[PDB]
């Protein structure tokens, strides 16, 4: 379970969308895009992966 | 009712304290009704931390 902060133009910036990536798996150490989400500018976002 | 869509969003939106304001005691209204004004838009209602 992840809860992601309410959207902030200062900390987040241009875009309210975010990309959750996966790292140390298999034989690939670098990032692989695992998920995308849209951040809420009125509350924090809850999701289970 | 008016109660949820207004007062709990009042709970969700925060201010200078830095997010949070959770766990605080609030003095809210039992029931709220139109009184006057040009056109009955979303309308001003406050709650007090």
XYZ file of C-alpha atoms in Angstrom:
98
model
C 0.000 0.000 0.000
C 1.244 3.448 -0.976
C -0.177 6.835 -0.065
C 1.183 9.702 -2.177
C 1.133 13.336 -1.089
C -1.316 15.923 -2.315
C -0.116 17.536 -5.516
C 2.214 20.504 -5.096
C 3.329 22.637 -8.064
C 6.485 23.576 -6.142
C 7.660 20.062 -5.220
C 6.124 18.136 -8.111
C 6.247 20.837 -10.761
C 4.759 20.959 -14.232
C 2.835 17.697 -14.165
C 0.384 16.127 -11.753
C 0.965 12.668 -13.211
C 3.612 10.372 -11.780
C 5.427 7.222 -12.858
C 6.144 4.500 -10.322
C 9.106 2.435 -11.504
C 10.558 -0.878 -10.414
C 14.254 -1.441 -9.799
C 16.207 -4.459 -8.550
C 14.466 -7.358 -10.296
C 15.533 -10.200 -12.561
C 18.702 -9.061 -14.275
C 17.787 -5.415 -14.740
C 19.083 -3.088 -12.036
C 17.936 0.136 -13.685
C 14.430 1.530 -13.664
C 11.499 -0.066 -15.485
C 8.188 1.841 -15.603
C 5.862 -0.241 -13.448
C 2.827 1.997 -13.013
C 1.416 5.416 -13.782
C -0.966 7.488 -11.705
C -2.600 10.911 -11.545
C -2.053 12.951 -8.394
C -4.907 14.579 -6.495
C -4.581 18.305 -5.818
C -7.255 18.062 -3.113
C -6.085 15.032 -1.104
C -3.487 12.276 -0.958
C -3.801 9.285 -3.257
C -4.149 5.692 -2.055
C -3.226 2.630 -4.078
C -2.194 -0.993 -3.662
C 0.305 -2.667 -5.997
C -25.992 15.886 2.830
C -24.400 19.316 2.963
C -22.544 17.876 5.958
C -20.250 15.497 4.116
C -19.548 17.325 0.860
C -18.851 20.590 2.681
C -17.457 19.950 6.134
C -15.317 16.914 5.376
C -13.744 18.775 2.464
C -13.123 21.533 4.992
C -11.369 18.811 6.967
C -9.358 17.733 3.933
C -8.190 21.207 2.935
C -5.553 22.610 5.258
C -3.514 25.781 5.756
C -0.434 27.325 7.301
C 0.109 24.638 9.945
C 1.558 22.357 7.292
C -0.920 19.759 6.038
C -2.323 17.722 8.913
C -4.805 19.486 11.220
C -5.855 15.889 11.904
C -7.094 14.817 15.301
C -8.315 18.320 16.105
C -11.636 19.302 17.644
C -14.088 21.138 15.408
C -17.175 23.231 16.100
C -19.392 22.645 13.070
C -23.001 23.288 12.110
C -25.836 20.819 12.604
C -27.832 21.816 9.508
C -27.264 24.645 7.027
C -29.786 26.279 4.691
C -29.801 29.045 2.088
C -30.370 32.492 3.427
C -29.869 34.966 0.579
C -27.539 36.256 -2.075
C -27.537 36.743 -5.840
C -27.324 33.123 -6.979
C -27.010 30.154 -4.631
C -23.617 28.828 -5.719
C -21.486 26.431 -3.698
C -21.586 29.107 -1.044
C -19.539 30.106 1.966
C -19.527 27.765 4.978
C -16.654 27.604 7.464
C -15.503 25.259 10.198
C -13.258 26.147 13.153
C -10.190 24.328 14.396
